[PDB]
Amino acid sequence: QFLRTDDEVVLQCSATVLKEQLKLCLAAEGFGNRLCFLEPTSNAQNVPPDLAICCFTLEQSLSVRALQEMLANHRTLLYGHAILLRHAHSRMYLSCLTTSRKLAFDVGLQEDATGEACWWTMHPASKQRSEGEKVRVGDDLILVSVSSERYLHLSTSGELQVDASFMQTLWNMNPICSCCEEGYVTGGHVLRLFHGHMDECLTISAADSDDQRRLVYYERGAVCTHARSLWRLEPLRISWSGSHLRWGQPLRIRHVTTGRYLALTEDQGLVVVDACKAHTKATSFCFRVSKEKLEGMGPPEIKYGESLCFVQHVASGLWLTYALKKKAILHQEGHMDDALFLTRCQQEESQAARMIHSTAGLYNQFIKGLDSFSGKPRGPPAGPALPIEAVILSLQDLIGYFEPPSEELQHEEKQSKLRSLRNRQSLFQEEGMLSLVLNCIDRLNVYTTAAHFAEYAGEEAAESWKEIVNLLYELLASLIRGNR
């Protein structure tokens, strides 16, 4: 009934578009782009929203005097309290930025929780709540930046955005999960699906495969530690999507590094499909106890490791089965040994897998823009603008991410940090990040100078040509660095 600290939440607002209400969640990537944006959730039945980057953790909830004393150097939320919100993926903190996209400031994530910028005071939306009262689940609230004294605001030229404005917006701090039972599978969890005990898991193929990475397999060996075998369980009901999963409950299964959804198609059978084509009927599955014919955290039913689960496609009733590497299919009978167990991926690996997803998406966009004016000069590029700012920041972020530990650190800590670095390098390497970085280099090296690049791209885009190539070479080096 009440919101507490260390609860996972989403910040939701609503807007009227085409005489219909549209629910929107506060989202940010962090790496490559600090700025917050809005992720629509109303059309979930047709197109699944990108929720992994919508999740925030309530770090602290402090009174006015408690904040002031903290700046000089599980608790229930009360009105008047100032809260610190940590982004689940990037590990960064929601803040009011000093830059502007009007007397509004931009809203985004910052690297460190220092100063007032990352603090937001909670205020009642009506006379039904008062200062010092317990913040209840489902309450509309007003959020005020401690630094700028402005409201967290839904802005509208023709797009729906977030900023810090003197205009008010009502926000719903919807709980994703609360204290949940240990060892139980919940929504939003990133995991692996294992078949037997021979190091065999459900996966798509490696990068650059003739597959186009659309097919699903049972694969043995090194896959079991690679990013390509990681999946995100996404229940159809957005409310309490981070609640315990139940037998028979419909859910979508998202592939982390590609962002594609397990689906049944009329033409291809069992494949993995783009988000835009991942509608309920094709993409909805459930865990079953057997093959017999058939608003809170809820009852805990599915255990990690100990529970054996059959995967069923809901609309068709077909079972997930196999055709070492065996193709995964959907079949009316399947096989007697179809039952799978689940194992929870830890945060370093899951974080890395999402970073790869966004990194791949961004640089592939950058590559597509480069190919757009490949043999087309200007007298007016005139294709879509290259994501210069995002590419630069992405590059800088990954370089810092792959930075070796300081030689001044102690041996025990250094070795552990080196081991973590190697594992993180490996996950990127196995997802074809070297080739991808190289493809950017090779395409930019087609040009001899910045001025030559300006003859095909813009003069403004050419201003960052030398910087991007140098940062790419730097990332390339950091991806290879042995770090033994």
Side-chain angles (χ1 to χ4, degrees), residues 128-129 132-133 135 137-156 158 160-178 181-196 198-211 213-236 240-245 247-265 268-280 282-292 294 296-367 369-371 373-375 377-405:
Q128 294 180 323
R129 300 287 179 268
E133 208 171 318
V135 180
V137 173
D139 285 5
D140 302 324
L141 46 141
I142 294 287
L143 295 161
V144 179
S145 153
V146 174
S147 61
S148 64
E149 285 169 36
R150 285 163 170 84
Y151 307 102
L152 189 69
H153 177 249
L154 156 74
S155 187
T156 317
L160 292 77
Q161 308 201 262
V162 219
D163 58 16
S165 178
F166 289 116
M167 286 303 96
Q168 286 177 355
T169 297
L170 301 178
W171 295 88
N172 283 295
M173 274 211 169
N174 294 153
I176 285 315
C177 72
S178 194
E181 201 70 33
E182 260 199 306
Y184 285 91
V185 186
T186 92
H189 272 19
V190 179
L191 52 76
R192 284 184 175 95
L193 301 92
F194 287 100
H195 182 237
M198 292 285 200
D199 297 324
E200 187 177 318
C201 69
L202 205 75
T203 185
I204 65 163
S205 61
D208 308 302
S209 293
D210 297 329
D211 267 352
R213 306 191 84 183
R214 306 303 170 96
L215 300 174
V216 185
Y217 302 89
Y218 293 80
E219 200 180 316
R220 290 188 181 181
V223 252
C224 302
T225 58
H226 296 168
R228 65 178 168 104
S229 61
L230 293 174
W231 307 83
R232 194 185 189 270
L233 301 187
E234 312 195 324
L236 297 187
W240 289 94
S241 57
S243 64
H244 300 121
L245 256 50
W247 305 108
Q249 184 191 347
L251 53 97
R252 278 190 272 249
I253 303 161
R254 187 190 169 99
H255 188 269
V256 186
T257 66
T258 53
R260 291 197 182 101
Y261 286 84
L262 197 72
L264 174 66
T265 310
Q268 298 272 128
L270 180 72
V271 288
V272 88
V273 162
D274 288 324
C276 68
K277 296 201 277 285
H279 57 81
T280 307
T283 188
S284 179
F285 293 85
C286 73
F287 298 112
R288 295 286 314 280
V289 180
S290 78
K291 294 190 180 185
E292 299 287 50
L294 262 183
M297 278 310 297
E301 280 167 21
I302 304 160
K303 282 135 72 210
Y304 281 113
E306 305 182 27
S307 294
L308 289 167
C309 323
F310 298 95
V311 178
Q312 188 174 27
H313 187 249
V314 179
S316 63
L318 306 175
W319 302 102
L320 176 66
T321 195
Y322 49 88
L324 260 156
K325 172 195 264 204
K326 312 182 287 284
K327 191 193 169 181
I329 59 158
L330 280 172
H331 188 80
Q332 194 163 112
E333 286 80 46
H335 297 81
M336 58 94 78
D337 67 321
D338 278 345
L340 307 172
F341 69 88
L342 315 171
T343 312
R344 181 139 183 247
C345 174
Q346 294 173 10
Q347 88 93 36
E348 177 159 298
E349 191 181 20
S350 63
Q351 194 192 44
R354 170 70 195 199
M355 295 187 234
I356 291 160
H357 169 75
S358 300
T359 303
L362 179 60
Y363 304 164
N364 277 139
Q365 183 194 330
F366 180 67
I367 284 161
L370 263 33
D371 293 344
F373 53 72
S374 187
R378 60 147 209 158
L386 303 158
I388 278 98
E389 195 170 307
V391 164
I392 291 173
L393 182 55
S394 180
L395 264 24
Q396 293 168 342
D397 281 332
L398 294 174
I399 287 159
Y401 178 73
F402 293 122
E403 194 189 353

